[PDB]
C-alpha cells in the first residue's frame, strides 16, 4: 500500500492545482491518496520531509501499512510536472491540461476545514453528511470566523467532497488526529476540532448511550442500571463489555472506529444487542438525548417510563436524606445548648 | 383564607362565563381564586362537593391555609346570579357584556394555563415564549388546537398574570400532573408539570445531581465546605413539602426565602459552571469562579469517559484470565 | 497460692458438713477456698482428681495463680478428720456442733450461690434483693424449692460474703454457665450467669452497644474524641480474658483497675444518657451532660424509626417501578 | 357522614351535661359523635368555630368524610335545648329529662384524659383496656398530677367509657393527634401524650418487633437479620415490606392504624407472616421484650436460642476488634520511639 | 500418665549423666520422659520445684494429662542413685554402670538447643530433619554464637536425637513454648526461638499457603482468591475453614499442631482438599515460595499461569489509578489558578 | 534519530558477522544500534521489511524518536559490503579479521543478552553474577547450552555494555517477553524479562504492594503524608508508558528523573523497612527509620496472621449457630 508524496519548491501552487482537480470533479484515481497527503503535509509541516517523517501522523500511518516514496522535482511549478508518464496516467494528464486561478496559501487549510465538516455524519451517508455540513457552514460563517466560496456550497460540489473524504482513510485520519490533539493553533484547527468533536461515536451511539446512561464507573466497580439487571439483557451486557474492550486498543481513536473503519467494529452493531439498545435508548430519551430505532418498541417505552419514575425517586430520596442529616444537626446543637445549661 | 365555591345546576354555563370574563380581561379581584377553583372542581370532580371535600387536592389546599365556602344558588343560570349583592360593585358592572359552547372548553382552558408553568418564575416573556413553543408541539401532534385569538400577546399576558397570582390554579395543575379519564388534556398538563420541576431552583437541581454524590464534587472539596452546610440547612426547609419540593419556587411554598444564593455564593457559581459543562443566573465577584468550574468540569468529564472505558477493558482482561484458567485447568496430560 | 482439696471415701459426708459449717456462720478462714473447691469438684467431677486435673476449670484456676494440694485421708468419715492438726485451732473448736441428707443438697447449695451473682458487685442489699426475686421465679416454676431458713437476711448475708470472697466459687459457677448431666441446677446457674454479663461494667456495655458502631455515635463526634482513645486502651486489657471479659468486674480479673470513668468522664455520662433513653452511676460536673444525652437519644431514636419506615416505603416504590417495567415491556402492540 | 356541632354561649354547662349523659349510661345513639366533638372543640378551641375550622384536626376529619353543620343556639343553657325535636330524638330527650351537679371547666379535660387511658389496649378488648387504664390511674394519682372520681373507677363505668371510645373514630383521632403533636401545654396533655405513646403499634406488634429486631436501616440499605435470610421467610419479608409501605401513607398516624382502623391494616395481620413472626418474637424475647403466640413454637425457641449465642458472639468480637486496634497503636508508638533513638 | 522428677542437690551432675546415657544410645525406656523433664526443669527453673509448679509449662502439661511425682534424694550424686530398684529398671542400671566426663552447666542448654534444630522438619522424617539440623548447625557455628562437639554431628548420633525428640511430647512442647514465649534471655533461647520459628506450620503448609495466598482478612470479611470462587472448590474452602477453626482452640500453639500431635489434625490433611491445595500451590509458586505435590498438576499450572497474569493486571491498574488521581489534582490546581485570574 | 537497517540476500551471513564483531570487542559506534536492530528483525520477522514496518515493535520504536533507514545492497555477501564507504574508517579497518554457522546462533545470542536484564541497572558485577546464575538454571534444564568462551568475565563485560547502551536491543527483548514460534529462546527471554519488572524501581514496587492499599499503611499515616503526594506525582509520569512502566528504569523511559527518593525520603525508608520484613538502597538520617519500620512490620504481620485465624474461627462459630438453628427449628414437639 504505497502512497505518493510530491516534493517541490513551488508547493503552494502545486497543492492548489490538486484542489482544483478535486473541485472540478476530476477523478484522481489511484493517485488521490497521495494528492491528499501532500496537502496535509504542506499545511501542517511546510512540506518539510524531515518534520513530517518524525510526526505522530506518519508513525500511525506506517503502523497501518503505508510506506511513502517521495517524488522530488524541486524545479516544478504545475501539478502535471510531478505526474509520472504512462498511458495509465495519461487520461488524468488529459483532464489536468483542462479546467482555476492561482490562490493563496490559506486555501489549503480552507479546503481541509471544509472536509472536516462532513465527518460528524459521514458514516450515515450522502444526505445526512451534506445536510449537517451546510448546518455547520452557517454556524461558522455566522460566527464570522470563516467564509466559504458559494460554488463550494452546491449539491454537486458537496457530493464530490463527501465521496473524496469517504474513500480516503488518510484524510479522515489526519483531520481526526489534529482535532483530538489540538495544542497551543489557528482556527482552521478550531473548526476541525469542533467537527471532530461532533464526530465522537459517530456510528457508535449504542456505545455512547450505554456508557452515558447504563454503565457508570465507581470506586470501585462498573455498575449496571437497574432496568438491565435481568438474565437475558445481562448476556448482551457481557457481549457489549467484550466488544467495547476490543475497541479500547485503539486508544484516543476508539470513538472514531466506525469513521476510520478500525479493526473490531463488526462486533459493535446495534443489531447484536437488541434488548440492551432498547433499554439504553429508553433511558436516554427520558433525559432528552437523541433518537431509526417495533418488536422492541414496548421495551423502549417501558424503559423510558420506568426511568422517569426512578429519577424522580432518586431526586426525592436525595432531598430527604439531606433533611434527615439536618434534623440530626439540630438535635446535636440542642445537645450542646443543653449540656451547658 | 376564605375562597368561594359556586354550586348551581348550570355549572357549565357559569364556568364558561368565568372563562369568558378572564379572557376579556375582567379583574375578578378577591373572587378570582374561587372562580378558578370552581373550574377545577368541575373538570376533575364534576362539581361533586362530597367527592372534592375528601380529595387529596382539598387536603393540601386546606393544609395551605384555605377554607372553602360554598354558595348554593340552584336558581341560577349565569355567573352574575351567584355573585353576592354587596355594593363588590365594579366587578358586577363589568359583567354586562360570549357563547357557552362545550364543557370541553373547560379543560382546553386549563391545559392552556399549564403551558405557562415551565418558565412562570422567570417572568412574562420567557413563560409566554415557552408556552408558544409548546403550542406548536401539541398542535403538530393534533391532540389539541388552540383558538388563534388565544395566541396573541395581549391574551397570553392575561393568562400569565392569572396563573401567576393564583395558588389554587397552579397547585391543582401540578397535583394532577405528578400523579396522573386519561385524556390528552391530562397528558399536556403532565408534560407541562414535568418540565416545571426545579423551575426557579436551578442551583438546587445541579447541586443535587452533580455536587452531592453523600460525597462532594472535587471542585467543592478544595474550595466553601461551610457554604454546603448553609445550603443543606436551606434545602431542608423544602423537604416538608414532599413530592412538591421541586415546585417550591413556582408554588411559593413555605421555606423558599431560606434559599438565597448569597448564603452560598461560591457553591452556586461552581454548580452553575458544572451544569453548563453538561449543557445548561448572575454574579460579578464569582464570574471567574463559574468560568473556572465549567472549564474544569469539561476536563473532568473527559477524564471519566476514559476511565470508564479503561475500567471495562480491564474487567475484560480479568475475565479472559479466568476463562483461560477454566480451560487450561481441564487440559489432559499423559 | 495453695488451695486444699480433700479426698476421702465419705466425700458427701464431708461436703455436707462444709455446707453445714458455712450455713452456721463458721469462718473457715484460709481453708474456705478449698472447702468450696471440694464442693465444686464433687458436684461436677465426682471427686475424680484425674478428671479434674485435665479439666478446663483447673486450667484457668492454675492460669489464675492457684496450685492444688490434695489431702488424702481415706480413713475419714467427717470434715474434722481432714483438717490439719496444727494449733488453725479456732476453726477446729467451732466444729464441735446437722444431717448429711442427699448429695443433691450440694447442687442445691451451688445453685443458691449463683443467684447472688447478677448484682454481687453492687453490694450486700442489691445482690440479696436480686437473689430473692430469682427465688420467686424458680420456685414458681417448681424446678427447685429452697429451705425457708435459707431465705432469711442473716443467712443470705452469710452466702453473699462467701461468694464475694471466693474467686474459685465465682469462677466455677460462671464457667459452667457460659458453656452449659443437664439438670435444672445447671439451668438456674446458667440463667444467673447470663444476667451477670457486664455486672459492674455498664459503661463498657452501653458504649459497645450504642456508642461504637467502627463508627462513633453522633453525640460523641462533636463533643471527647480522646476519651474514646483512653476507653479503648482500658478495655483492651480485659480482652485477654476471652469469653470471660464480661465478668471482669465480678471476677476481679487482671485489668479492671484501668477502667475508671475518670479517664473518660464525658463518654461515661453520654453513654449512660443513651442507655436510659433505651430503658436502663454518678457525677456532678457531668450530670447535665447525661440529661442532654438522654434527651438527644430519645429524639434520635424517634428519627431513626421514621427513617427506617420511609426507607422501606421507598424500596417498595422502587420495586413497583421495576415490576411495572417487566409487565409493560411485555405489552403486545399491533 | 354528617356530625352535629352545638354552639352556644353556655358551652361549659352544655358540655358537662353531655358528660353527665355518657357517665349515666344514656345511649346518645347517632348523636354521640357530635356530642363528643363538641367536647373536643370546647376543650382545645374554646368553642371558637373559626379557630377550629382552621385546625389540623378539622382538616383531617374532613379528609376522612366528615362535614360539620353547626347548631347555633347562643341563648341556650341545658343540653336538651340544642337537641332538635323529633319522635326519634324524643327517647333521648326523655332520658335527658332524668338523671348531676354543675361542675368546673376542668371536668371536660378530666374526662378526655380519662378516655385516653383506654387507648393502649383498646384493640385487645374490654378486659385488657380496662385493666391497663386502672394501672395508669394509679400511676398518675401516685404521681399526684391527677385524681379521678371513685365512681369513675367501677367496672360498670369503665365499661361504658370503653364502648364510647371504641365506637368513636373522632374521639380516638383527636386524642391521638393531640398526643403526637404536643407543643409548648397542660398536663391533661401529658397524660394523653403518655397514653398515646403507650398506644404506638397497639395491634401491630409484629411490625414493631420486626422493625426493632429484624430490620435495620443503614447507609445505605435495609438489612435482614441473619436468621431470616432463608427462602421461605424471605417471601414473608417481601410481603411484610409491601404491607408496611402501605401504612406509611398515613404518616405520623401509621403506628395507630389498628386503633384508628386505617386503610391497609388487613394486610398486616400476624397470621399472614407465621415464620417471620416466630423468628422476630424469638429474637425479641432473647433481649427481654414482651410476649398469645405451637406449630411455630420450635421456630421461636430456636430463634431465641440462636440470637442469644449471636449477640454474645457480636459482643466478644467487638471487644477483640478494639483490642486489635490497640495493639496496632502500641506498635506505632514503639515505632515512633525507635525511629528517634 | 505419670512422669518422674528427680530432685537432688547435685542436679548439674545428675543431669549430665542423663545426657550421657542418651548420647551413648542407652534406651531409657519408660523413664525417658522424666529424664528429659528433669533437664528442662534444671535449665529453666534451677530445679526449683516451687518455681516450676507455678510455671506455664507445668500448667499446660497438667492440662494434657501429666501428673508429677518428685523423687527426693538430695544426698545423691550419680544418676543411678535416683533410679528406683526393681529387676525392670535393672537392665537400665546395668547400662548406666557402663559407658563420660563431668561437664559444665552449659552442656544442659547446649543439649536442648541441639534438639530444637530437629523441630523444623521433624514431622517429615529421619532424613529431612537431620539434613536440616546440620544446615542450621553451620549457620549458628558460622555466626559463631555456638559450637557443637563433632561427635554430636555423626549420622548415628543425630539419628538418636531425632528418635528422642520424636517420641517426647514434653521435650517438643517445652522447646516450642520457650521459643514462642521468649522474653527479656540467653542465646540458647535465640537458637531455640529461631528453630521454633522455622517450625511454624511444619506439616501444615496447606494451611500456610491458603492463609497467605488464598484467604485475606479485611474490614470486614474474609475474602476468597478469584481462582477459588467456583462450586467444587468452594466446598473444600468450607471444610478448610471448619478444620482450621478446630485448630484455633490451641491458640499460640496451633501452628505446631502437627509437631505436637494436637487434637484436630486429621481433618487438616492435604488429601482432603485436592483442588484447594493445587490452586494455592499454583498461586504460591507464582510468587516464589516453596514446593511432593499429576491428576491435579494441570490445575496447579493453570493457577500459577493465571496468578502471574492477575498480579500484573493488579500492578498495572494500581499505577493507572494513581495517575488518574493525579490528573484530577492538576485540574483542581488549574481550577484554583483560573478562579483568581 | 536515524538507525540503519541492512537488507541483503545473505542476511544470516551478515548477521553472524555482526555477532562476530561484537563478541570480538569491535566498537561499532553509531552503527551498533542498527547492527542490533538488524539481528532482531531477522530473528522475529525474517528480514521482512513490510512485516516489521507495521509491527508493534516498530510502532513503539518510532514512538520513542527512531526513524529507520534501509540500506538495500542485494549484491552483498558479508557485513563489510553494506557499511557506507565514507572515510567511518576505524570500524571498516577492524573488520579485516569467525564462522557463520546456523541461523539459530542469532537467537542464542539474543537469549544470552536477555540474561543481563534482571540486574542491568544495578551495574557491571550484579548483572553478570545474575546472568551466570541463570546460565546454570537453563543449562541444567538442557533447553540451551552456551559456548564456554561466552562465559568469561571479559566476554560478559562486552555483552553487558552492549545491552546497557542499546535501547533498541533492551526494548525488543522486553517487548517479546511481556506478550510472548514459541521456542525456548522465547521462554528464556520471557523469564528474564519477568525478573526485570521494577528493576531499579524497588521503592515503587514495595510502596505499591505494601504502602498503598487506596488506604495508607499505618506506619505512613502517623509519620510523610505529603511525601506520598510527591511520590504520587512522580509515579504518574511513568503511567503513560503503559505495560512498560515496570521497566522505566531499565529502559530509561521519559519520566524517571522525577522519581528521586530525595522528594520522599521517609516514605522510601519505611517502604524498604516493610519490604525486608517480607524478605527483601541507602540513607543516613533515615537509617533508624528503616530499622523501626522493619521491626514494626514484622510485629504487624504476626498480628494479622492471628487476626486472620481468629476471623475464620468466628465465622465458623457463626456458621454453627445458624446450622444448629435450622436443625433446632425443625424439631418435632408433641
Short mmCIF file of N, CA and C in Angstrom, two decimals, chain D residues 114-224:
data_model
loop_
_atom_site.label_atom_id
_atom_site.label_comp_id
_atom_site.label_asym_id
_atom_site.label_seq_id
_atom_site.Cartn_x
_atom_site.Cartn_y
_atom_site.Cartn_z
N UNK D 114 -59.23 10.84 80.92
CA UNK D 114 -59.67 9.52 81.35
C UNK D 114 -59.87 8.59 80.16
N UNK D 115 -60.46 9.09 79.08
CA UNK D 115 -60.67 8.28 77.88
C UNK D 115 -59.36 7.79 77.28
N UNK D 116 -58.35 8.66 77.25
CA UNK D 116 -57.08 8.31 76.62
C UNK D 116 -56.42 7.11 77.27
N UNK D 117 -56.71 6.86 78.55
CA UNK D 117 -56.07 5.75 79.25
C UNK D 117 -56.48 4.40 78.68
N UNK D 118 -57.62 4.33 77.99
CA UNK D 118 -58.09 3.10 77.37
C UNK D 118 -57.44 2.83 76.02
N UNK D 119 -56.75 3.81 75.44
CA UNK D 119 -56.15 3.63 74.11
C UNK D 119 -55.08 2.55 74.06
N UNK D 120 -54.12 2.46 75.01
CA UNK D 120 -53.02 1.49 74.85
C UNK D 120 -53.46 0.06 74.59
N UNK D 121 -54.62 -0.35 75.09
CA UNK D 121 -55.08 -1.73 74.93
C UNK D 121 -56.48 -1.80 74.34
N UNK D 122 -56.95 -0.72 73.70
CA UNK D 122 -58.31 -0.67 73.18
C UNK D 122 -58.58 -1.81 72.19
N UNK D 123 -57.66 -2.05 71.27
CA UNK D 123 -57.89 -3.04 70.22
C UNK D 123 -57.88 -4.47 70.74
N UNK D 124 -57.39 -4.70 71.96
CA UNK D 124 -57.40 -6.05 72.51
C UNK D 124 -58.79 -6.42 73.01
N UNK D 125 -59.49 -5.48 73.64
CA UNK D 125 -60.83 -5.74 74.13
C UNK D 125 -61.12 -5.33 75.57
N UNK D 126 -62.41 -5.38 75.89
CA UNK D 126 -62.96 -4.98 77.17
C UNK D 126 -62.06 -5.07 78.40
N UNK D 127 -61.59 -6.27 78.69
CA UNK D 127 -60.78 -6.52 79.87
C UNK D 127 -59.37 -5.94 79.91
N UNK D 128 -58.60 -6.12 78.84
CA UNK D 128 -57.23 -5.62 78.81
C UNK D 128 -57.19 -4.10 78.85
N UNK D 129 -58.10 -3.44 78.13
CA UNK D 129 -58.10 -1.98 78.11
C UNK D 129 -58.46 -1.41 79.47
N UNK D 130 -59.41 -2.04 80.17
CA UNK D 130 -59.81 -1.55 81.49
C UNK D 130 -58.74 -1.87 82.54
N UNK D 131 -58.17 -3.08 82.49
CA UNK D 131 -57.12 -3.43 83.44
C UNK D 131 -55.90 -2.54 83.28
N UNK D 132 -55.61 -2.08 82.06
CA UNK D 132 -54.48 -1.18 81.87
C UNK D 132 -54.82 0.25 82.28
N UNK D 133 -56.03 0.71 81.97
CA UNK D 133 -56.44 2.04 82.39
C UNK D 133 -56.36 2.20 83.91
N UNK D 134 -56.80 1.18 84.65
CA UNK D 134 -56.71 1.23 86.11
C UNK D 134 -55.25 1.29 86.56
N UNK D 135 -54.37 0.56 85.87
CA UNK D 135 -52.95 0.62 86.17
C UNK D 135 -52.39 2.02 85.98
N UNK D 136 -52.81 2.71 84.91
CA UNK D 136 -52.34 4.07 84.67
C UNK D 136 -52.96 5.07 85.63
N UNK D 137 -54.22 4.85 86.03
CA UNK D 137 -54.85 5.73 87.01
C UNK D 137 -54.04 5.76 88.30
N UNK D 138 -53.53 4.60 88.73
CA UNK D 138 -52.70 4.57 89.92
C UNK D 138 -51.40 5.33 89.69
N UNK D 139 -50.76 5.13 88.53
CA UNK D 139 -49.50 5.81 88.24
C UNK D 139 -49.68 7.32 88.32
N UNK D 140 -50.72 7.85 87.67
CA UNK D 140 -50.91 9.30 87.64
C UNK D 140 -51.36 9.82 89.00
N UNK D 141 -52.24 9.08 89.69
CA UNK D 141 -52.68 9.51 91.01
C UNK D 141 -51.58 9.32 92.05
N UNK D 142 -50.68 8.35 91.85
CA UNK D 142 -49.48 8.28 92.67
C UNK D 142 -48.56 9.46 92.36
N UNK D 143 -48.34 9.75 91.07
CA UNK D 143 -47.64 10.98 90.71
C UNK D 143 -48.30 12.21 91.30
N UNK D 144 -49.59 12.12 91.65
CA UNK D 144 -50.31 13.25 92.20
C UNK D 144 -50.63 14.35 91.22
N UNK D 145 -50.42 14.12 89.92
CA UNK D 145 -50.83 15.09 88.90
C UNK D 145 -52.31 15.05 88.55
N UNK D 146 -53.06 14.05 89.00
CA UNK D 146 -54.49 13.98 88.72
C UNK D 146 -55.13 13.08 89.76
N UNK D 147 -56.43 13.27 89.97
CA UNK D 147 -57.25 12.38 90.78
C UNK D 147 -58.62 12.24 90.13
N UNK D 148 -59.07 11.01 89.97
CA UNK D 148 -60.33 10.77 89.30
C UNK D 148 -61.42 10.38 90.30
N UNK D 149 -62.66 10.83 90.09
CA UNK D 149 -63.75 10.44 91.00
C UNK D 149 -63.89 8.93 91.09
N UNK D 150 -64.10 8.44 92.32
CA UNK D 150 -64.14 7.00 92.55
C UNK D 150 -65.27 6.33 91.78
N UNK D 151 -66.37 7.04 91.54
CA UNK D 151 -67.46 6.46 90.77
C UNK D 151 -67.14 6.33 89.29
N UNK D 152 -66.02 6.91 88.83
CA UNK D 152 -65.49 6.64 87.50
C UNK D 152 -64.69 5.34 87.44
N UNK D 153 -64.32 4.77 88.58
CA UNK D 153 -63.38 3.65 88.65
C UNK D 153 -64.05 2.30 88.87
N UNK D 154 -65.38 2.23 88.78
CA UNK D 154 -66.07 0.96 88.87
C UNK D 154 -66.12 0.29 87.50
N UNK D 155 -66.21 -1.05 87.52
CA UNK D 155 -66.25 -1.81 86.27
C UNK D 155 -67.37 -1.34 85.35
N UNK D 156 -68.55 -1.07 85.91
CA UNK D 156 -69.68 -0.68 85.09
C UNK D 156 -69.52 0.69 84.45
N UNK D 157 -68.74 1.57 85.06
CA UNK D 157 -68.49 2.87 84.46
C UNK D 157 -67.36 2.80 83.43
N UNK D 158 -66.29 2.06 83.75
CA UNK D 158 -65.18 1.94 82.81
C UNK D 158 -65.56 1.10 81.60
N UNK D 159 -66.54 0.20 81.74
CA UNK D 159 -67.07 -0.50 80.58
C UNK D 159 -67.82 0.46 79.66
N UNK D 160 -68.49 1.46 80.23
CA UNK D 160 -69.19 2.45 79.42
C UNK D 160 -68.20 3.26 78.60
N UNK D 161 -67.10 3.69 79.22
CA UNK D 161 -66.13 4.54 78.54
C UNK D 161 -65.38 3.75 77.47
N UNK D 162 -65.09 2.47 77.74
CA UNK D 162 -64.50 1.62 76.70
C UNK D 162 -65.38 1.59 75.46
N UNK D 163 -66.67 1.30 75.64
CA UNK D 163 -67.57 1.25 74.50
C UNK D 163 -67.68 2.58 73.79
N UNK D 164 -67.59 3.68 74.55
CA UNK D 164 -67.72 5.00 73.96
C UNK D 164 -66.51 5.29 73.07
N UNK D 165 -65.31 5.07 73.61
CA UNK D 165 -64.09 5.28 72.85
C UNK D 165 -64.00 4.32 71.66
N UNK D 166 -64.44 3.07 71.85
CA UNK D 166 -64.29 2.06 70.80
C UNK D 166 -65.08 2.42 69.55
N UNK D 167 -66.26 3.01 69.73
CA UNK D 167 -67.15 3.34 68.62
C UNK D 167 -66.87 4.69 67.98
N UNK D 168 -66.05 5.53 68.61
CA UNK D 168 -65.86 6.91 68.17
C UNK D 168 -64.49 7.05 67.51
N UNK D 169 -64.50 7.19 66.18
CA UNK D 169 -63.26 7.50 65.48
C UNK D 169 -62.78 8.91 65.80
N UNK D 170 -63.72 9.86 65.92
CA UNK D 170 -63.36 11.25 66.20
C UNK D 170 -62.65 11.35 67.55
N UNK D 171 -63.20 10.71 68.58
CA UNK D 171 -62.59 10.79 69.90
C UNK D 171 -61.22 10.12 69.90
N UNK D 172 -61.11 8.96 69.26
CA UNK D 172 -59.81 8.30 69.17
C UNK D 172 -58.81 9.16 68.39
N UNK D 173 -59.26 9.76 67.29
CA UNK D 173 -58.35 10.56 66.48
C UNK D 173 -57.87 11.81 67.21
N UNK D 174 -58.80 12.56 67.82
CA UNK D 174 -58.44 13.81 68.49
C UNK D 174 -57.40 13.56 69.57
N UNK D 175 -57.62 12.54 70.39
CA UNK D 175 -56.65 12.21 71.44
C UNK D 175 -55.30 11.83 70.86
N UNK D 176 -55.30 10.99 69.82
CA UNK D 176 -54.04 10.56 69.22
C UNK D 176 -53.31 11.74 68.59
N UNK D 177 -54.04 12.60 67.87
CA UNK D 177 -53.42 13.78 67.27
C UNK D 177 -52.80 14.68 68.34
N UNK D 178 -53.59 15.07 69.34
CA UNK D 178 -53.07 15.94 70.40
C UNK D 178 -51.92 15.29 71.16
N UNK D 179 -51.85 13.96 71.18
CA UNK D 179 -50.80 13.29 71.92
C UNK D 179 -49.51 13.18 71.14
N UNK D 180 -49.61 12.97 69.83
CA UNK D 180 -48.42 13.02 68.98
C UNK D 180 -47.93 14.45 68.82
N UNK D 181 -48.84 15.41 68.69
CA UNK D 181 -48.46 16.78 68.37
C UNK D 181 -48.59 17.71 69.57
N UNK D 182 -48.05 17.29 70.71
CA UNK D 182 -47.91 18.18 71.85
C UNK D 182 -47.00 19.35 71.49
N UNK D 183 -47.28 20.51 72.08
CA UNK D 183 -46.47 21.70 71.81
C UNK D 183 -46.10 22.38 73.12
N UNK D 184 -45.72 23.65 73.04
CA UNK D 184 -45.28 24.41 74.20
C UNK D 184 -46.46 24.86 75.06
N UNK D 185 -49.67 24.03 76.97
CA UNK D 185 -49.39 22.63 77.29
C UNK D 185 -49.66 22.31 78.75
N UNK D 186 -50.89 21.89 79.04
CA UNK D 186 -51.24 21.46 80.38
C UNK D 186 -50.81 20.00 80.57
N UNK D 187 -51.15 19.41 81.71
CA UNK D 187 -50.81 18.02 81.94
C UNK D 187 -51.96 17.06 81.69
N UNK D 188 -53.17 17.56 81.43
CA UNK D 188 -54.12 16.74 80.69
C UNK D 188 -53.48 16.29 79.39
N UNK D 189 -52.67 17.17 78.79
CA UNK D 189 -51.95 16.84 77.57
C UNK D 189 -50.88 15.78 77.83
N UNK D 190 -50.18 15.89 78.97
CA UNK D 190 -49.10 14.94 79.25
C UNK D 190 -49.63 13.56 79.57
N UNK D 191 -50.81 13.47 80.19
CA UNK D 191 -51.45 12.17 80.38
C UNK D 191 -51.88 11.59 79.04
N UNK D 192 -52.56 12.40 78.22
CA UNK D 192 -52.98 11.95 76.89
C UNK D 192 -51.76 11.59 76.04
N UNK D 193 -50.69 12.37 76.14
CA UNK D 193 -49.48 12.06 75.38
C UNK D 193 -48.86 10.75 75.85
N UNK D 194 -48.76 10.55 77.16
CA UNK D 194 -48.19 9.31 77.68
C UNK D 194 -49.07 8.12 77.29
N UNK D 195 -50.39 8.32 77.26
CA UNK D 195 -51.30 7.26 76.82
C UNK D 195 -51.14 6.97 75.34
N UNK D 196 -51.09 8.01 74.51
CA UNK D 196 -50.90 7.83 73.08
C UNK D 196 -49.55 7.19 72.80
N UNK D 197 -48.53 7.55 73.58
CA UNK D 197 -47.22 6.96 73.39
C UNK D 197 -47.25 5.46 73.63
N UNK D 198 -47.90 5.04 74.71
CA UNK D 198 -48.07 3.62 75.01
C UNK D 198 -48.96 2.90 74.00
N UNK D 199 -49.66 3.64 73.14
CA UNK D 199 -50.55 3.07 72.13
C UNK D 199 -49.85 2.83 70.80
N UNK D 200 -48.60 3.27 70.66
CA UNK D 200 -47.90 3.12 69.39
C UNK D 200 -47.75 1.65 69.02
N UNK D 201 -48.29 1.28 67.86
CA UNK D 201 -48.26 -0.08 67.33
C UNK D 201 -49.14 -1.04 68.14
N UNK D 202 -50.07 -0.51 68.93
CA UNK D 202 -51.13 -1.32 69.52
C UNK D 202 -51.88 -2.07 68.43
N UNK D 203 -51.84 -3.39 68.50
CA UNK D 203 -52.38 -4.23 67.45
C UNK D 203 -51.47 -4.35 66.25
N UNK D 204 -50.20 -3.99 66.40
CA UNK D 204 -49.24 -4.05 65.30
C UNK D 204 -47.86 -4.39 65.86
N UNK D 205 -47.81 -5.26 66.87
CA UNK D 205 -46.53 -5.56 67.50
C UNK D 205 -45.63 -6.38 66.59
N UNK D 206 -46.20 -7.09 65.61
CA UNK D 206 -45.38 -7.76 64.61
C UNK D 206 -44.57 -6.74 63.84
N UNK D 207 -45.21 -5.62 63.47
CA UNK D 207 -44.48 -4.53 62.83
C UNK D 207 -43.39 -4.02 63.75
N UNK D 208 -43.72 -3.83 65.03
CA UNK D 208 -42.75 -3.29 65.97
C UNK D 208 -41.57 -4.24 66.16
N UNK D 209 -41.85 -5.53 66.40
CA UNK D 209 -40.77 -6.48 66.65
C UNK D 209 -39.88 -6.65 65.43
N UNK D 210 -40.47 -6.66 64.23
CA UNK D 210 -39.67 -6.77 63.01
C UNK D 210 -38.80 -5.53 62.84
N UNK D 211 -39.40 -4.34 62.98
CA UNK D 211 -38.65 -3.10 62.82
C UNK D 211 -37.52 -2.98 63.84
N UNK D 212 -37.77 -3.42 65.07
CA UNK D 212 -36.78 -3.26 66.14
C UNK D 212 -35.69 -4.33 66.08
N UNK D 213 -36.06 -5.56 65.75
CA UNK D 213 -35.15 -6.69 65.90
C UNK D 213 -34.73 -7.33 64.58
N UNK D 214 -35.55 -7.27 63.54
CA UNK D 214 -35.28 -8.00 62.30
C UNK D 214 -34.69 -7.09 61.23
N UNK D 215 -35.22 -5.88 61.08
CA UNK D 215 -34.77 -4.94 60.07
C UNK D 215 -34.04 -3.78 60.74
N UNK D 216 -33.06 -3.22 60.03
CA UNK D 216 -32.37 -2.02 60.48
C UNK D 216 -31.87 -1.24 59.28
N UNK D 217 -32.14 0.06 59.27
CA UNK D 217 -31.72 0.93 58.18
C UNK D 217 -30.26 1.34 58.36
N UNK D 218 -29.53 1.42 57.24
CA UNK D 218 -28.11 1.78 57.25
C UNK D 218 -27.85 2.80 56.16
N UNK D 219 -26.57 3.15 55.99
CA UNK D 219 -26.13 3.97 54.87
C UNK D 219 -25.23 3.16 53.94
N UNK D 220 -25.83 2.50 52.95
CA UNK D 220 -27.27 2.54 52.73
C UNK D 220 -27.83 1.14 52.49
N UNK D 221 -29.14 1.00 52.70
CA UNK D 221 -29.81 -0.27 52.55
C UNK D 221 -30.49 -0.70 53.83
N UNK D 222 -31.50 -1.55 53.73
CA UNK D 222 -32.21 -2.09 54.89
C UNK D 222 -31.84 -3.56 54.99
N UNK D 223 -31.10 -3.91 56.04
CA UNK D 223 -30.53 -5.24 56.17
C UNK D 223 -31.48 -6.19 56.91
N UNK D 224 -31.32 -7.48 56.62
CA UNK D 224 -32.11 -8.55 57.21
C UNK D 224 -31.32 -9.21 58.34
#
